[PDB]
Amino acid sequence: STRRLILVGRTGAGKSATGNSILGQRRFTRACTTGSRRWDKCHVEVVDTPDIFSSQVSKTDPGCEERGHCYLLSAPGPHALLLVTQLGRFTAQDQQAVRQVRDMFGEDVLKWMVIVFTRKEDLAGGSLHDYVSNTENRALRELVAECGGRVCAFDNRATGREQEAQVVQLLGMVEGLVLEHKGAHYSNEVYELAQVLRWAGPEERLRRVAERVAARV
Numbered sequence: 483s484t485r486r487l488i489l490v491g492r493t494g495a496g497k498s499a500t501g502n503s504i505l506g507q508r509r510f511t512r513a514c515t516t517g518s519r520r521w522d523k524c525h526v527e528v529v530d531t532p533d534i535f536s537s538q539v540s541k542t543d544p545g546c547e548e549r550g551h552c553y554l555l556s557a558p559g560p561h562a563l564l565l566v567t568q569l570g571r572f573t574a575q576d577q578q579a580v581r582q583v584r585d586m587f588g589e590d591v592l593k594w595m596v597i598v599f600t601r602k603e604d605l606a607g608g609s610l611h612d613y614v615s616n617t618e619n620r621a622l623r624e625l626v627a628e629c630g631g632r633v634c635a636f637d638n639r640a641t642g643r644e645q646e647a648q649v650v651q652l653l654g655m656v657e658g659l660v661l662e663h664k665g666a667h668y669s670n671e672v673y674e675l676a677q678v679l680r681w682a683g684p685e686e687r688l689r690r691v692a693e694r695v696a697a698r699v
């Protein structure tokens with residue numbers, strides 16, 4: 483009935499392009515933004531993210547207002563976090579983005595995480611399972627295992643049936659994950675505060691949610 487996804491990862495990973503592919507729209511910038519698509523009888527909601535996963539987030543988003551906005555847009559919690567990364571370019575910056583995500587949501591959030599690889603065409607027609615299996619990048623290897631081997635490849639220039647197939651594959655994985663959690667979305671003490679304060683006005687809700695995020699990072 484509803485699937486809430488959040489796109490996370492470094493700047494230039496391909497978050498915005500991936501979101502456009504999923505939504506089938508040219509939808510996706512200092513702020514979090516959102517889009518959605520009605521598929522069958524399911525409402526797929528995608529939150530795209532700005533520069534909030536760098537080592538400079540502390541200077542870019544000092545009172546955690548933008549990190550707070552991400553929570554409000556995804557409340558009561560995501561069914562999956564999509565960690566977007568570029569095929570052949572898993573860098574120190576990608577590793578920094580993963581740590582920011584952990585800091586921002588909690589260690590348990592990797593149990594709701596799917597890794598999306600952009601630039602699929604760089605496999606030159608070869609499979610992703612082989613590429614993931616034979617990479618010399620230890621840190622990528624580790625991350626894939628921490629995310630239960632949930633990996634998926636996108637060519638964000640794909641249109642037509644090639645695009646439908648990559649999106650269908652990703653949504654299948656998200657369903658798999660949701661069933662693993664017996665239908666539960668990810669939650670923590672910040673999402674709970676957002677829900678508790680759901681009757682309050684948007685200004686106090688944002689202020690108090692930003693405040694809870696700041697206390698934990």
Ligand SMILES: Nc1nc2c(ncn2[C@@H]2O[C@H](COP(=O)(O)OP(=O)(O)O)[C@@H](O)[C@H]2O)c(=O)[nH]1
Nearest residue numbers: 493494495496497498499600601602636637638
């Ligand atoms: N060739 C190719 N380019 C891509 C793909 N995905 C993203 N890009 C390009 O990578 C650049 C950064 O992507 P963007 O979505 O803006 O990254 P973001 O900062 O993570 O939102 C853009 O110029 C995209 O066109 C892909 O699958 N194939």
Ligand SMILES: [Mg+2]
Nearest residue numbers: 497498499531
């Ligand atoms: Mg972007």
